[PDB]
Design a protein around this ligand. Sequence first.
Ligand SMILES: *[C@@]12Nc3cc(C)c(C)cc3N(C[C@H](O)[C@H](O)[C@H](O)COP(=O)(O)O)C1=NC(=O)NC2=O
Ligand SMILES: *[C@@]12Nc3cc(C)c(C)cc3N(C[C@H](O)[C@H](O)[C@H](O)COP(=O)(O)O)C1=NC(=O)NC2=O
Lengths: 133, 133
Amino acid sequence: MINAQLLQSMVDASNDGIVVAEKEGDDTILIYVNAAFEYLTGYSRDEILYQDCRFLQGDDRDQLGRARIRKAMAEGRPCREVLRNYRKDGSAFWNELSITPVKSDFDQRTYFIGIQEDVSRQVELERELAELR
Amino acid sequence: MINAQLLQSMVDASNDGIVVAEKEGDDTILIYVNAAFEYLTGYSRDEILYQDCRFLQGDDRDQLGRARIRKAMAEGRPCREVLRNYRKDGSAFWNELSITPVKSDFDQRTYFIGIQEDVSRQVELERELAELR
Ligand SMILES: *[C@@]12Nc3cc(C)c(C)cc3N(C[C@H](O)[C@H](O)[C@H](O)COP(=O)(O)O)C1=NC(=O)NC2=O
Ligand SMILES: *[C@@]12Nc3cc(C)c(C)cc3N(C[C@H](O)[C@H](O)[C@H](O)COP(=O)(O)O)C1=NC(=O)NC2=O
């Protein structure tokens, strides 16, 4: 195998944003974030941790990605949806969320792992393709 | 923090393909793969592990993504490039590689973490945008 401490060091250092969260009913509470996620969000580790990251949505909460994420998490299936989130400075970015539900048989509670990426460029290009079509 | 054993369990179960590799000169040798990477490649864990994953390129080795990956790994900077890889059955897919170099100060050798995704759909749509333009 691999030393879990080494794997943790690799995850903390990945330029991709990696987050882990635990379920508390309707809400999903974050338990781990990496430095890449801090850079993408602008918020700090203590500021982000131990809450649901729906705060990144802010007032812009009428987004279809929310519902498909909620539906997938309830159905126990992975999902990959793009939402418009806002940084601490107020900058708006398109974030692709790859959320995968995991069940710890020993704990009998549910955790979620998410990998994020600023795909604002891809969204703009596909919008350009749409207006051409 | 978070229990590294739990983080390892979350990584093993992510639907995104996560791999870790160690550097041996020009070659980079894999030390960890997850079940998602097995599904994307079709090859098995024992078949994939402990080798450079350039084998996914096969005869199609005249690809510009190779060089930019090699340049970035040498420069100690992360990279995100798309390459055409081939599964065990011979199926061809466009794989986006997010490779992040990590240096263990204690070990003084270099490891790499990569997150993969079959972006064949995105490549086809951008090709369609190009022929429209
Ligand atoms: C958040 N990324 C993210 C990562 C994980 C691992 C989970 C489980 C969830 C998110 N996420 C979605 C948000 O937390 C809510 O779960 C979602 O809106 C559905 O529930 P709701 O309809 O709010 O009750 C994130 N959303 C974001 O906006 N940005 C992220 O990076
Ligand atoms: C491979 N994904 C991948 C993941 C990591 C963590 C690394 C370090 C490298 C790759 N990778 C690239 C390949 O192994 C070579 O490093 C690359 O071609 C540059 O060196 P070379 O020019 O061959 O000497 C992968 N390539 C793939 O084709 N598919 C993957 O998923």
